[PDB]
Design a protein around this ligand. Structure first.
Ligand SMILES: Cc1ccc([C@@H]2O[C@H](CO)[C@@H](O)[C@H](O)[C@H]2O)cc1Cc1ccc(-c2ccc(F)cc2)s1
Ligand SMILES: CC(=O)N[C@@H]1[C@@H](O)[C@H](O)[C@@H](CO)O[C@H]1O
Ligand code: NA
Lengths: 586, 29
């Protein structure tokens, strides 16, 4: 309402419109190559900027600060796991995907295994995973921040956001979104750094964070309701392992073996096997450019600790009776939610700490985060639908109809997400961040197991790969069923879910589900007849440098030997910086 | 001390990457 906020929002919109129009003037959007794969023309800095921007949503500010506030600094685990896994994309997965000449990841499995059915299954499962784990977090986290910072209606505002992100998406092709993601990555990091600075000034620096956070409890621990009573000292006090990434393997809220192995499996699906991330690598200029952009995205994926997690811990220090509330009546008074108020962590700091001009910039940061992420989902889902499912229903389609079907899917998945918004508004507090990471851990590991055996074990065949995936979903729903039948509650109001169902952390069941899906794939593969080498050139890690004539069930990934040496050194130095920081906060 | 945990972490990482070169240098060629 102060004019400076409107001028900052207008400036940010004019940058985004300006770079959109420049990208459409530059690139060709008339063909499937151009509109869906950016012409296979993107150099390193848009690839890095877009990998980062397509990941970092409104969820990352709401969820990481909120969980920061609630549970200390182990949530950085989610971000920092990514650092290691982006190196597996650039060096192992990205080469095979370039030599296969695929537009979608289901199409890679069609080439590797060769039935009709694996491609169809993985397309339809990916569509359900994006409605559940990716749209839901962005719509929800959007809605939190609008209700807290602005107070505007969280239905109509989500419709208006979904509406503008539709137009942003359908107007340009992957080339528009990746150049716009270099503007959005600048604003996201820039404004996030300004708020980090104001926050750290208010607690009295970095020393201030680490000497005030363990004391920072609410003074209201007594309910008016009998059979809640005195809230336990366990569940309003901050956790005594709040300053440690690496927490206890049986009693930790995120056990260290589950963090490292179990997140690597679920991060493997997210970064190496999934249409949304891998489309940025399929539109690279050359493998050297992909590897270079994977290093940039890596250094950026350290930033979220210092920009989201530690700010949310500072909100606990500054507003403990509102951010760290435990009594149901008090929490219902503060932000509407009986189960807690962690979620207001990040958007209290924007309301309280930011002056007249920079409140606008922090609105532009949330907008930048949300639009980049929802557009990347709408484009990647468009590709999945068009290329895998619509080319089934119409085989002799051609590149004019396929772009129209691409554009009409973006309209349809916006309307499905509007229909879905009330189900996601049913999530009460930080239940959604926890459930997203559960769902990911119950459906992703079989896919992680298939793409690793598809890429590294040439004996694995279509019967194995398919019944591996379906056995996977049976095991994954045996837990994704029973739990959600019980509900969630809080530490104050525990759910009645049995210990033998819920006591195993979801990231440990990721490790079990991966090895059981792995073992099933290999067993059924080794029983049934194998696929010979003539079907498999440039589709497997062994044979990415083949030159032999494949029989189907620019493919040229060499490198300026000097520039190879550059990106290889920066991979090892970027892992050294990773490893140091995991040590520092262990 | 946090800084020693950092340096120990790096040290162990550089041992494992030195091993990864060693193994592929002697067992792939
Ligand atoms: C909202 C969100 C959505 C997606 C991710 C990605 O998850 C992928 C895994 O499937 C990773 O591989 C990617 O590296 C990561 O960037 C991370 C966050 C940040 C969180 C807020 C809050 C979170 C949370 C809350 C409670 C928990 F118990 C655990 C996590 S997690
Ligand atoms: C609900 C409940 O247990 N109430 C008790 C209260 O009777 C007692 O005076 C107080 C002393 O700290 O501890 C609490
Ligand atoms: Na984003």
């Amino acid at each position: 309402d102060n004019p400076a906020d409107i001028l900052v929002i207008a400036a940010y919109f004019l940058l985004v419109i300006g770079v959109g129009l420049w990208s459409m003037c530059r690139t060709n959007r008339g063909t499937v190559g151009g509109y869906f794969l950016a012409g296979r023309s993107m150099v390193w800095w848009p690839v890095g900027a877009s990998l980062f921007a397509s990941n970092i949503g409104s969820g990352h500010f709401v969820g990481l600060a909120g969980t920061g506030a609630a549970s200390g600094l182990a949530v950085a685990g989610f971000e920092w796991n990514a650092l290691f896994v982006v190196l597996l994309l650039g060096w192992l997965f990205a080469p095979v995907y370039l030599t296969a000449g695929v537009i979608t990841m289901p199409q890679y499995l069609r080439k590797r295994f060769g039935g009709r059915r694996i491609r169809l299954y993985l397309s339809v499962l990916s569509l359900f995973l994006y409605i559940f784990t990716k749209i839901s977090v962005d719509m929800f986290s959007g809605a939190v921040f609008i209700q807290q910072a602005l107070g505007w209606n969280i239905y109509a505002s989500v419709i208006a956001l979904l509406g503008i992100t539709m137009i942003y998406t359908v107007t340009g092709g992957l080339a528009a979104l990746m150049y716009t993601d270099t503007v959005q990555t600048f604003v996201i990091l820039g404004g996030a750094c300004i708020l980090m600075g104001y926050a750290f000034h208010e607690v009295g620096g970095y020393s201030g964070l680490f000497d005030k956070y363990l004391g920072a409890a609410t003074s209201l621990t007594v309910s008016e309701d009998p059979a809640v009573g005195n809230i336990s000292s366990f569940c309003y006090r901050p956790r005594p392992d709040s300053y440690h990434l690496l927490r206890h393997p049986v009693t930790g809220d995120l056990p260290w073996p589950a963090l490292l192995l179990g997140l690597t499996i679920v991060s493997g699906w997210y970064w190496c096997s999934d249409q949304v991330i891998v489309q940025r690598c399929l539109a690279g200029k050359s493998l050297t450019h992909i590897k270079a952009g994977c290093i940039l995205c890596g250094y950026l994926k350290l930033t979220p600790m210092f920009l989201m997690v530690m700010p949310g811990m500072i909100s606990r220090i500054l507003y403990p009776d509102e951010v760290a509330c435990v009594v149901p009546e008090v929490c219902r008074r503060v932000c509407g939610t009986e189960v807690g108020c962690s979620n207001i962590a990040y958007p209290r700091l924007v309301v309280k700490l930011m002056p007249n001009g920079l409140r606008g910039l922090m609105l532009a940061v949330m907008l930048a985060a949300l639009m980049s992420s929802l557009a990347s989902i709408f484009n990647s889902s468009s590709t999945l639908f068009t290329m895998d499912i619509y080319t089934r229903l119409r085989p002799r389609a051609g590149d004019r109809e396929l772009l129209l079907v691409g554009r009409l899917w973006v309209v349809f998945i916006v309307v499905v997400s509007v229909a879905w918004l009330p189900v996601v508004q049913a999530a009460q507090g930080g239940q959604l961040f926890d459930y997203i990471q559960a769902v990911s851990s119950y459906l992703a590991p079989p896919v992680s197991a298939v793409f690793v055996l598809a890429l590294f074990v040439p004996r694995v065949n279509e019967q194995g790969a398919f019944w591996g995936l379906i056995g996977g979903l049976l095991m994954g729903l045996a837990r994704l069923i029973p739990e959600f039948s019980f509900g969630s509650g809080s530490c104050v109001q525990p759910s009645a879910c049995p210990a033998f169902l819920c006591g195993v952390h979801y990231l440990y069941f990721a490790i079990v589900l991966f090895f059981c899906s792995g073992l099933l794939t290999l067993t059924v593969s080794l029983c049934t007849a194998p696929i010979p080498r003539k079907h498999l050139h440039r589709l497997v890690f062994s044979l990415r440098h083949s030159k032999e004539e494949r029989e189907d069930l620019l493919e040229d990934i060499s490198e300026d030997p000097s520039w190879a040496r550059v990106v290889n050194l920066n991979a090892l130095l970027m892992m050294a910086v990773a490893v140091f920081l995991w040590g520092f906060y262990a | 001390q946090p800084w020693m945990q950092g340096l120990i972490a790096v040290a162990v990482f550089l041992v494992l990457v030195a091993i990864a070169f060693a193994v592929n240098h002697f067992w792939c060629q």
